[PDB]
Design a protein around this ligand. Structure first.
Ligand SMILES: [Mg+2]
Ligand SMILES: [Zn+2]
Ligand SMILES: [Zn+2]
Lengths: 148, 1335, 62, 49, 50
DNA sequence: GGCTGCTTCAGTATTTATACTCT
DNA sequence: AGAGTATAAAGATACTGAAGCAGCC
């Protein structure tokens, strides 16, 4: 009955017709299938997704950049990404991706200054969430410290 | 800066010294002025000023008043940064216990006071007393007293003797426990100890006591008397990170503690009934416990929503403690996220990057360039300029981008190729362009996947992203050196439609003077694209010393192949094209290009392939119509005959001629038959619908049905899909796992009616749920994997050894499963290999085997090679390069420093989500070999083999084994050794439904020791009739003849025991129960008739349990040492078996369950590692008995087996290194001249170097046995605690480390990240070499 | 409402009643059931007031 | 949604994996445009002072 | 208007989306058979019959 | 008395209704 | 901030492991 209806029109019962290119005008061999399909639009609109961040709002407990798009939040650089970036001999990018670009407070300010001043260089320091962990264990009866 | 982290326990004086003043009051904030209380939880006087350089009164505000303290409040004027790190301390009235040290399982208290934990718990919660200083009465130093008993013993003995209950009691107890004397007494008692159980208990206790006495600790420090409090800005009253407000619940807990503490003190000014003081002390203990580690006590307390509030410790456990949430994986600045799209105009080393995002990310660079050129003066000038997006910022932007790589990443970063570098080009949109070849490493479809963009900053990061992670350096999957830039699915269809051949096409038969002529003829439309033609071509070649000589000829091709040949670079053979170019073909083309030419030409040529494939795929116009699904006009005939046949079977069963299970299986089989028939008919019809004339009558060729072109080219799909499209679609499963009788006799071109759609739906949803939970499990598995290895760094070049494994091609018995070429492809051999011309070496001893030597050994019919390995490497703290092999991502030896452990972990884990959840009829022709043979020629001319270690190895004519087969005890070989054999005929067959137990001598037999009533039973055979008196099992016999088992002492017609040939011990065997002797007694026996008859997962979980070394359910018992067998006391709980040597003393007299069917009889002689029972295997025994290489080859074999049924292809090096990390602990048995103890484990490297140092002098080292630990156990039982604390159950590992007072130099990776330093993997390896060499 | 407050209320009421039993008239009012009930009741309600106002402090700071 | 005229064929790879290629008789006729309504509110509270 | 990809069909066995596409065109075919019949004028009896 | 099979437990994947009177 | 106060009986995971514990030959 589909073919009967196609014949009531005039199109080929095969349902495929010959097309041409628009850039060259030379026929496409192997007749192709054109028709009418009911297309939708799903509300994952790209402008709701696209999001970047230069420098924004840190937290107080641990001075890591906030998370999400509602806030001016950075990206989640999870475990697996550290494993993978560690499989390469990539030893400096992994450093700066968890001391300067995230948490070392003095370090990241000096980084901003040295970037404005045309000097791509970093002073690592020591993270902050680590010191949080220390004061949090040492708050139990566990004397945890560092040697020389 | 700082050296190792050190940890210990905290004496109360230390807590006091840390603090800045005693917190005293339970209130926090003034509620109107929002100032701290006078001495509350937040008072500025203890910690510091709430704001910068001020007090609450308002008399100091600026640097004019820096350093001095206030007058009224007296708070010191300083920064506010110090309010983040100053602690406080509560002073408790009634001392309190540390719930870690009491419910840690084990209890570092419960095993130091030796009492079961219930007692110390009932004492601490005030329900019984404890007799401190039992003194001159009938009471013991650790005796508990019920209140009744206490009252009474006070009536009789209300003397000076001490008796208390509560934390102070245990405190005094621990205070009154000398340690050195206790340790000496336990040393003595252990020396005297006899049982193993109490021996183990005593050694655990003595280990803990030594741990204490050595380190600067003391037992009473487990009991809390002064409690340190957490600085306020680490738990601010309300955190206030926008939006919702949080609680920072610690505050609450703290308050309650102080509250109750305060209350207690006031009762000490009221002299209350001591029942109430006791109840208050109980409440205080409970509160301190719930604060330190909630939930550990019986019930956790909830603030609201019934959600248990987060105690202090729960800020370190779980997926959300500092470890798994903020020390390993933190959020980062300078980053973005978007959706992705294609842009097939890109090269391989660039990606799209929307203008908006790029403007946001590189902002500080832009400000720098502006303030350099002078286009602004202040920073805000630059900000406003950028904000108005003036026409000058764009040139600055596309200037700074010039060579500033970005790092792209996808969400689940499975393997190393989920994060790669690029150089971006600006784009007018909001989406990321991505080169269509790289969407395989990312496994990124375009259904709306998203990606993240990061930006390196410093010089080093840019150099690393450019030289290491660039997209044009990673074309070889580090798992297996196969190329990962395979053009996926449209390029393939283009290149496959191009290089083909129609039978008789326009412009055929001509002759062309080069490719360009073919191109012109195509564009001009004068000649078709796939038409047979003869064209001149030229080919360069590099047969010279790296020089390309040219040579031309007149080949016979089609137009398409000619055109394509313009793409191929210089030095390739033209034969690489003449074929029809499916998908695997072009992958091999790329591989050959890589091996022959190098790297840059390879990527260039792949890019060009992409261009051309896309172009001619478009030019094709390859739609997919509805008439591309053709139905065999006989499908209804196949189905009609199948359904007419099934009705006969149905009425046959119903009319009572067969059972129901048989009928069911018969219907299933006829349906499978019809299905395969119709699938074959359809596929053959569709593949050659071509019937076409060629200036003659007609001809046929491979068809042009677009669906077929998509199938055979490897473009998209398998023949199963086409089967479901045109033919019937299988039989679907059932929820249980069974199969329904009637199958689905329709397809996706007819219409499935309702029921069939229903059933298919069932199957589909089952699949989907499986996929979800499969990702779930595989994630955990790969986590454990990466954790256990986590630290192996190639730190040598040659460990200096001559060991290894005999790599040999695997054969499952029929077809080969892997040629030797692969197993040793790129792996340094141990010793030189000899031609099968023995004493004629073929390659030196220490050479890296790349493809040249691979083919060389391939043609010479080499069989097996002792190749080096990592399991037997000879390095302390690492592995040598040579033991590893080739990098598998670059065609050369692995460099010195690469972190092979992590890449191994990722490679083994990534494919995880792809997993799931007789006789010898030899077919080939070659020589036969036997193995482990003992046999006898039968009375029917044939030779029956009568051992269980027996195995056939069918060699070819050359000397390489091609088949292998197992023959059990007593199988009649048709042919002897050395004789050739053809295909089809059997070589041996036995009776599996019984146990042939023919004797291997000549003599006689009797019905001796076979007496009814007590030993045997009269039994008339119920099928033939001959007297077949079976012996009932001893458990079914009478009690007297239960141990009195029957025997048949084999003799001759004289009665003398017929000696087994050469043996002084004839076959005097205890025939077990269920041993039917159908033949009569006193009859002569010849070989060829038995003496008695005894009638008769694979998913990812398998990989998991094999890696954890789970022990099977019914293991197979092995042979510790040689000798003979004997049976004794029947079932002292379980049956008994004793084994004796031939010369040594018999040490093995063990229990065996009755059901165990023995596999070695009494007179038999076995050897170390021989098998005694049947069933699954236990790897620990494999290790301890057969050695180390046995277990490593075992594991390798089974895991490759699981990863082989699913087409996945993993090199072996990785499972080898995982194993090497599994077995790392050695248990000593003999000190030798060393100092270590008897039962304690040691790091194998440590005991090894200790031996090396003792044996430097004439002294004798220690003797040990290695042991196998599952990954989940060797991880936790490691050298460092931060490493293990980062892993599961931080509580236990942490408290044990604290008890011992450990120390961690962080010689590793997962711990040098927490600290945030240069890991010793890449450049960090060199840096650490230098830094360690500083000292 | 909650076991985190209720225990504090009970401990407070017990301390209050113990402190206050100092003043019980023995020659009249021969029932102390109601006496102790009233004491613990008053301490209960005081505790509930203090807690609720501390929570309000959290809000008012927010 | 809107029912369009569509042709099934590869096109220079701009519909490589599952991407879609769209003409400009669809961005011009504005038959896939939508309207969005963000609501914002401000209130006059009463604190101290 | 839109250029889909045929490779998406044979594996993800959703034949419907193609089969629909045929019917779709057929339907539009009867539209352009009226639009022409109606744009240039035409008595109502013919449209009735068609 | 030592050896052994159950047995129990530990480990892993926003928002809370009510003094009285002094003093 | 403190202190005197007098009816009342008011809940469906699943799997793995290790120490503990009664019992036996
Ligand atoms: Mg998708
Ligand atoms: Zn003041
Ligand atoms: Zn080595």
């Amino acid at each position: 009955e589909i073919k009967e209806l196609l014949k009531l029109g005039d199109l080929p019962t095969s349902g495929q017709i010959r097309l041409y290119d628009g850039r060259t005008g030379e026929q496409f061999e192997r007749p192709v299938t054109v028709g009418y399909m009911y297309m939708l639009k799903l509300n994952h609109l790209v402008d709701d997704k696209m999001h970047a961040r230069s420098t924004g709002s840190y937290s107080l407990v641990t001075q890591q950049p906030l998370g999400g798009k509602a806030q001016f939040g950075g990206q989640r650089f999870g475990e697996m990404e550290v494993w993978a970036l560690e499989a390469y001999g990539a030893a400096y990018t992994l450093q700066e991706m968890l001391t300067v670009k995230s948490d070392d407070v003095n370090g990241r300010t000096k980084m901003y200054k040295n970037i404005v001043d045309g000097n791509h260089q970093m002073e690592p320091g020591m993270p902050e969430s680590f010191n949080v962990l220390l004061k949090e264990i040492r708050s139990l009866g566990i004397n945890i410290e560092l040697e020389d | 800066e700082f050296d190792a982290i050190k940890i210990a326990l905290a004496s109360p004086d230390m807590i006091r010294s840390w603090s800045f003043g005693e917190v005293k009051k339970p209130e926090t904030i003034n509620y109107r002025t929002f100032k701290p209380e006078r001495d509350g939880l937040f008072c500025a006087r203890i910690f510091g000023p709430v704001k910068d350089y001020e007090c609450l009164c308002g008399k100091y505000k600026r640097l004019k008043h820096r350093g001095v303290i206030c007058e009224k409040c007296g708070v010191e004027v300083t920064q506010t940064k110090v309010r983040r790190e100053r602690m406080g301390h509560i002073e408790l009235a009634s001392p309190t216990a540390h719930i870690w040290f009491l419910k840690s399982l084990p209890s570092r208290i419960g095993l130091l006071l030796d009492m079961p934990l219930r007692d110390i718990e009932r004492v601490l919660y005030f329900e019984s007393y404890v007799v401190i200083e039992g003194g001159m009465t009938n009471l013991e130093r650790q005796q508990i007293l019920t209140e009744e008993q206490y009252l009474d013993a006070l009536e009789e003995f209300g003397d000076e003797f001490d008796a208390k209950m509560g934390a102070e009691a245990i405190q005094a107890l621990l205070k009154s426990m000398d340690l050195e004397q206790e340790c000496e007494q336990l040393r003595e008692e252990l020396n005297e100890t006899n049982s193993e159980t109490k021996r183990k208990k005593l050694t655990k206790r003595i280990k803990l006591l030594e741990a204490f006495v050595q380190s600067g600790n003391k037992p009473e420090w487990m009991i809390l008397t002064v409690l340190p409090v957490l600085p306020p800005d680490l738990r601010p009253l309300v955190p206030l990170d926008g939006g919702r407000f949080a609680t920072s619940d610690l505050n609450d807990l703290y308050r309650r503690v102080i509250n109750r503490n305060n209350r207690l003190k006031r009762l000490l000014d009221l002299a209350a009934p001591d029942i109430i003081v006791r109840n208050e002390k109980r409440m205080l203990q409970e509160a301190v416990d719930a604060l330190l580690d909630n939930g550990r006590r019986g019930r956790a307390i909830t603030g609201s929503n019934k959600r248990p509030l987060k105690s202090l410790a729960d800020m370190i456990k779980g997926k959300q403690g500092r470890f798994r949430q903020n020390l390993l994986g933190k959020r980062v600045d300078y980053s973005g996220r978007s959706v992705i799209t294609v842009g097939p105009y890109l090269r391989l080393h660039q990606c799209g990057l929307p203008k908006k995002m790029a403007l946001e990310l590189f902002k500080p660079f832009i400000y720098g360039k502006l303030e350099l050129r002078g286009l602004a003066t202040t920073i805000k000038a630059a900000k406003k300029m950028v904000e108005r997006e003036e026409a000058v910022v764009w040139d600055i932007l596309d200037e700074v981008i010039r060579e500033h790589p970005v790092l792209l990443n996808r969400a689940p970063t499975l393997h190393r190729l989920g994060i790669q570098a690029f150089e971006p080009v600006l784009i007018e949109g909001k989406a990321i362009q991505l080169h269509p070849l790289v969407c395989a490493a990312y496994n990124a479809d375009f259904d709306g996947d998203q990606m993240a963009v990061h930006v390196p900053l410093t010089l080093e990061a840019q150099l690393e992203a450019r030289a290491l992670m660039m997209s044009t350096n990673n074309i070889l999957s580090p798992a297996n050196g196969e190329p990962i830039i395979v053009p996926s699915q449209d390029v393939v269809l283009g290149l496959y439609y191009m290089t083909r051949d129609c039978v008789n096409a326009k412009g055929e038969g001509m002759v062309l003077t080069g490719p360009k002529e073919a191109e012109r003829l195509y564009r001009s439309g004068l000649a078709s694209l796939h038409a047979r033609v003869k064209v001149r071509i030229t080919e360069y070649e590099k047969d010279a010393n790296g020089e390309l000589v040219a040579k031309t000829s007149l080949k016979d091709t089609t137009v398409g192949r000619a055109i394509l040949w313009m793409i191929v670079p210089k030095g390739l053979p033209y034969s690489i094209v003449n074929q029809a170019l499916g998908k695997k073909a072009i992958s091999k083309m790329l591989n050959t290009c890589y091996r022959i030419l190098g790297l840059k030409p390879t990527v260039i040529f792949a890019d060009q392939i992409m261009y051309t494939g896309f172009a001619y795929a478009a030019r094709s116009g390859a739609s997919v119509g509805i008439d591309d699904m053709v139905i065999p006009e006989k499908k209804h005939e196949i189905i009609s005959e199948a359904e007419a046949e099934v009705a006969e079977i149905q009425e046959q069963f119903q009319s009572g001629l067969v059972t129901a299970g048989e009928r069911y299986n018969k219907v299933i089989d006829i349906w499978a038959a019809a299905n395969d028939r119709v699938s074959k008919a359809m596929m053959d019809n569709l593949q050659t619908e071509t019937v076409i004339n060629r200036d003659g009558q007609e001809e046929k060729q491979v068809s042009f049905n677009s669906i077929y072109m998509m199938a055979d080219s490897g473009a998209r799909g398998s023949a199963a899909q086409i089967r479901q499209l045109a033919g019937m679609r299988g039989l679907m499963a059932k929820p249980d796992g069974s199969i329904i009788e009637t199958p689905i006799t329709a397809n996706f071109r007819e219409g499935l009616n309702v029921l069939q759609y229903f059933i298919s739906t069932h199957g589909a949803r089952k699949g989907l749920a499986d996929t979800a939970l499969k990702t779930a499990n595989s994630g955990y598995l790969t986590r454990r994997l990466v954790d256990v290895a986590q630290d192996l760094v190639v730190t040598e070049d040659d460990c200096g050894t001559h060991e290894g494994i005999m790599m040999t091609p695997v054969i499952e018995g029929g077809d080969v499963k892997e040629p030797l070429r692969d197993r040793v492809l790129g792996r340094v051999t141990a010793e030189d290999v000899l031609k099968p011309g023995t004493a004629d070496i073929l390659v030196p001893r220490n050479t890296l085997l790349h493809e040249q030597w691979c083919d060389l050994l391939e043609e010479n019919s080499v069989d097996a090679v002792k190749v080096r390995s990592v399991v037997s490497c000879d390095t302390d703290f690492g592995v040598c390069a040579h033991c590893y092999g080739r990098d598998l991502a670059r065609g050369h030896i692995i460099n010195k420093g690469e972190a092979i452990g992590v890449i191994a972990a990722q490679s083994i884990g990534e494919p995880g989500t792809q997993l799931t959840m007789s006789s010898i009829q030899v077919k080939n022709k070659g020589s036969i070999k036997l193995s482990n043979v003992k046999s006898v020629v039968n009375s029917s001319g044939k030779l029956v083999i009568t051992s269980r270690n027996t195995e056939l190895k069918l060699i070819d004519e050359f000397g390489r084994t091609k088949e292998s087969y197992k023959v059990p005890y007593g199988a009649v070989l048709a042919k002897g050794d050395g004789e050739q054999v053809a295909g089809g005929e059997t070589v041996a067959n036995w009776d599996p439904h019984t146990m042939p137990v023919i004797t291997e001598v000549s003599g006689f037999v009797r019905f001796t020791d076979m007496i009814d009533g007590q030993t045997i039973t009269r039994q008339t055979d119920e099928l033939t009739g001959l007297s077949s008196l079976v012996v009932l099992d001893s458990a079914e016999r009478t009690a007297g003849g239960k141990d009195l088992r029957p025997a048949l002492k084999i003799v001759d017609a004289q009665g003398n025991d017929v000696l087994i040939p050469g043996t002084d011990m004839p076959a005097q065997y205890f025939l077990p129960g269920k041993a039917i002797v159908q033949l009569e007694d006193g009859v002569q026996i010849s070989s060829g008739d038995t003496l008695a008859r005894i009638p008769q997962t694979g998913g990812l979980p398998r990989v998991a349990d094999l890696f954890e070394a789970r022990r099977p359910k019914e293991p197979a018992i092995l042979a510790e040492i040689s000798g003979i067998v004997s049976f004794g006391k029947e079932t002292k709980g379980k049956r008994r078996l004793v084994i004796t040597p031939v010369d040594g003393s018999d040490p093995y007299e063990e229990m065996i369950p009755k059901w165990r069917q023995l596999n070695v009889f009494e007179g038999e002689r076995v050897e170390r590692g021989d098998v005694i029972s049947d069933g699954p295997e236990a790897p620990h025994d494999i290790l301890r008995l057969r050695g180390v290489h046995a277990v490593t080859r075992y594991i390798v074999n089974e895991v490759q087996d699981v990863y082989r049924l699913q087409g996945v292809k993993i090199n072996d090096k990785h499972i080898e290194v995982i194993v090497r990390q599994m077995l790392r602990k050695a248990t000593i048995v003999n000190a030798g001249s060393s100092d270590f103890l008897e039962g304690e484990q040691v790091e194998y490297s440590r005991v090894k170097i200790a031996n090396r140092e003792l044996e430097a002098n004439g002294k004798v080292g220690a003797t040990y046995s290695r042991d196998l630990l599952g990954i989940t156990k060797a991880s936790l039982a490691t050298e460092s605690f931060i490493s293990a604390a980062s892993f599961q159950e931080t509580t236990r590992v942490l408290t044990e480390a604290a008890v011992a007072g450990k120390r961690d130099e962080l010689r590793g990776l997962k711990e040098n990240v927490i600290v945030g330093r240069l890991i010793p993997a890449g450049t960090g390896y060199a840096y650490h070499q230098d830094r360690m060499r500083r000292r | 409402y909650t076991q985190s407050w209720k225990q504090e209320m009970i401990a407070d009421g017990i301390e209050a009643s113990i402190k206050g039993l100092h003043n019980f008239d023995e020659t009249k009012y021969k029932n102390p059931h109601a006496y102790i009930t009233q004491a613990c009741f008053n301490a209960f309600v005081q505790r509930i007031k203090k807690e609720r106002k501390e929570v309000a402090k959290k809000y008012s700071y927010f | 949604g809107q029912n369009m005229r569509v042709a099934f064929m590869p096109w220079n790879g701009y519909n490589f994996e599952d991407s879609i290629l769209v003409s400009e008789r669809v961005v011009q006729e504005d038959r896939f445009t939508t309207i969005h309504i963000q609501e914002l509110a401000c209130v006059s509270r009463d604190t101290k002072l | 208007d839109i250029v889909l990809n045929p490779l998406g069909v044979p594996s993800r066995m959703n034949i419907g989306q193609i089969l629909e596409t045929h019917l779709g065109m057929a339907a539009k075919g009867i539209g352009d058979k009226i639009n022409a019949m109606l744009k240039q004028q035409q008595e109502v009896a013919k449209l009735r019959e068609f």
